[PDB]
Design a protein around this ligand. Structure first.
Ligand code: NO2
Ligand code: NO2
Ligand code: NO2
Ligand code: CU
Ligand code: CU
Ligand code: CU
Ligand code: CU
Ligand code: CU
Ligand code: CU
Lengths: 332, 332, 332
């Protein structure tokens, strides 16, 4: 009887940060209560000042990472305020039935709904909006995120030994398809209905105009760079709701990688680059061994360095000259 | 001596259905005899009525799924009737030597040939036409299918326990590259020779105009939706002869997935989405747990919902409110 | 103390050949000394005579395959002669720290540098040039290669038994993005600075104009076809620094495949086609069973047969009619 289970309310945080949770379950199964509010808003996505009408869960692209344990129940209250103009819903790849919840969560502006589902499979999973007849538009406008369902005894390596992370970050990679005129400049629109056929035409090229981490070119750089220290074990969760991506930590590795994100499978070891299929979330564990700046990129380098799919880690600590050294510094 | 083996003639069926076979081999190795007749025909591939000149094995896109056991011999009689205009052949990725049989099966219109090969590796494998100098044209005009070579003791899970399916479906995903004029309308042609350079130019964009299951937008929907019942174990074989695809069952999972299709490898567990590389067939096993409509899609959602790469399952049975429930239905 | 280790100087060879090495380490850890000289040069990449300004390590696209054992130290002397015009550096995906060495190896023309790093993870790894603000231009102009770090006890199969290769080849697959005018003809340029914005614009299409093995259409064909004999165990290392590829040996298989190239993981068995993500190197082991010509291709067949991503193996020996035979040769 689900009514006899403990309930716990989670307060979500903005990516790339992740709400507090326990890796190993410290309670029995619980109903884990989340609330998200849909926000349609203008977002500046690049250095040129290109501004799109984003569709978001909780004001961010991506939506927040939700974290539960296997065989918990996830209960989501989804709010569509009357300040929005569109119908939205939510589909969880973690859930079973009703198009992942999409069939049960259609909310017009001024409506709310509450969905409960049992998290029966451990892994990281995409969630996204999926309104009938409009699915790729919503998803490619930013309306996606991920949920992590941890095994009750936490993560394990290929030999079944515990893998415990010290820090976790969530990188949502978003492909935008900003409509272009024939000269190649981005077009702007006065209503969603007036933008829609042009959105569809831009999507049908299959060529994103921008591919960004955390919602904008340069979002995970500067004062918003990811951080770690030498010796820290970091889990990076990475999702892409629509298009394949190939994450790579420049100067590092994926020590243990679940490229398709499902923790019942043994991880791949020592990866340089891993492929996360469109519509999947993956997770990579790394222990930093050197200080300095790392670039975390989609290793289609055009996507990384021309279209925006790159962020930085700033790592503190001691340099290890055994692992790498300049023997002769650049000279004539 | 192959002449001392039993011979069994198979009568093929139209995808997404699969000819009758045994999962566990009930005989010793056999020569399994198949016949396919090449048919060049006009096919309407979308709701707008876009009509292409398809090149098919046995009148269908994809070609039929052939099913044998490891170390059977496959004997194929390939017929190119004099009503066709082109040279064709057949390459099996399951076979060893002679470009998969392609070098030995070149048939002009009015010719036939018979190829025999030993199915030495268990898995699902693409087959396709591959005439010298014209390969991608034939393949992207529909001339591809798959063959499943089952282990003699049937499929096994990651622990080596039997996995037995109740139903099997074959989804062939086809990328078409319909030539477009500068305004973006599809062009039409009076002969294959007159279409060819325009075909090549359209292929060189690397951007399909259509991506469809079972040969047309909406082919696996409505009265042609895939079916199952709650509790049924279903194997979905999915092939793509030219381009990567990322299947996803909306509302379900791949309980056991061989994303690159080869059964000597342990399956990946609990997949949301899996990547099948171009030129590969993969196979996903799922036990349905909820009734209703599921969408089976390529999870590039643009490819799914704008370009045609989506089908439906209709699943009968009892709803499980423990797994998913609406707690508060959408309301003001 | 690294000064007490043996030093061994390697003389590199042109791809697809690989310098001589031992599969099983016959010495303790060593400092393995390599020298590469950067060469900017004009290269004819297709049958039409399209000529690009290539940027190379050691005069070749790809750069040479370096081969060391796990926990060796790699010491590279990188030379940028004053005959070149650009700044270059080198990033090794095998290395840990300083952006894979990129931060420590920036060499102006007329400069050289020496980097040492410990090869701590066994696998095949990409290396490439990565100058700040210009990364995809250098990489997509040919400035990439791979390094193989073998386990000290050589390669092993999925059961931990030795896999020993008789021959090894390195296939570098390169995506070029040759700028096109509006009519679609390739443009030509009088300086790198004058080409750069057009390079960027061509890259931003995400649609390569050429995809080639060993630096040009047809490079691994004819007198430069790869060779083997029936019964020979061949390892093919394949890298792609920027874009996903899906290798396939037409008429063969990948008996044992490390699609993401890392030897601590068990190989995938019996692959028809495998996906190597952009920014990764993979390795496939095959024992030839039939003589004749094989085509080794990217199984996006458009990329293979229209854009250049295809090479040949010529295999000597005895035909096995048990594995494949023409029963009835093509006839009326
Ligand atoms: O085929 N693009 O996901
Ligand atoms: O690179 N397309 O398969
Ligand atoms: O998304 N191309 O690597
Ligand atoms: Cu929405
Ligand atoms: Cu989805
Ligand atoms: Cu054909
Ligand atoms: Cu093929
Ligand atoms: Cu360079
Ligand atoms: Cu790199």
């Amino acid at each position: 009887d689900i009514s006899t289970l403990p309930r716990v309310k989670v307060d979500l945080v903005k990516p790339p940060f992740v709400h507090a949770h326990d890796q190993v379950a410290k309670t029995g199964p619980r109903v884990v209560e989340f609330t998200m509010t849909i926000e349609e808003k203008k977002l500046v996505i690049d250095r040129e000042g290109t501004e799109i009408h984003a569709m978001t869960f909780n004001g961010s692209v991506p939506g927040p990472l939700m974290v539960v344990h296997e065989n918990d129940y996830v209960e989501l209250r989804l709010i569509n305020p009357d300040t929005n103009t569109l119908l939205h819903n939510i589909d969880f790849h973690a859930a079973t039935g009703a198009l992942g919840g999409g069939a049960l969560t259609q909310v017009n502006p001024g409506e709310e709904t509450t969905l409960r589902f049992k998290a029966t499979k451990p892994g990281v999973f995409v969630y996204h909006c999926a309104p009938e007849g409009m699915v790729p538009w919503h998803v490619t406008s930013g309306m996606n995120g991920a949920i992590m369902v941890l095994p009750r005894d936490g993560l394990k390596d290929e030999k079944g030994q515990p893998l415990t992370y010290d820090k976790i970050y969530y990188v949502g990679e978003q492909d935008f398809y900003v409509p272009k005129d024939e000269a190649g400049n981005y077009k702007k629109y006065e209503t969603p209905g007036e933008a829609y056929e042009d959105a569809v035409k831009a999507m049908r090229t299959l060529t994103p105009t921008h591919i960004v981490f955390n919602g904008a070119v340069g979002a995970l750089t500067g004062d918003h760079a990811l951080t770690a220290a030498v010796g820290e074990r970091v889990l990076v969760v990475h999702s892409q709701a629509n298009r394949d991506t190939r994450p790579h930590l420049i100067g590092g590795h994926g020590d243990y990688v679940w490229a398709t994100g499902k923790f019942r499978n043994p991880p791949d070891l020592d990866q340089e680059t891993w492929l996360i299929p469109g519509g999947t979330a993956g997770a990579a564990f790394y222990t930093f061994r050197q200080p300095g700046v790392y670039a975390y990129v989609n290793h289609n380098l055009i996507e990384a360095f021309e279209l925006g799919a790159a962020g930085h880690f700033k790592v503190t600590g001691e340099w290890n000259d055994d692992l790498m050294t300049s023997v002769v510094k650049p000279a004539s």
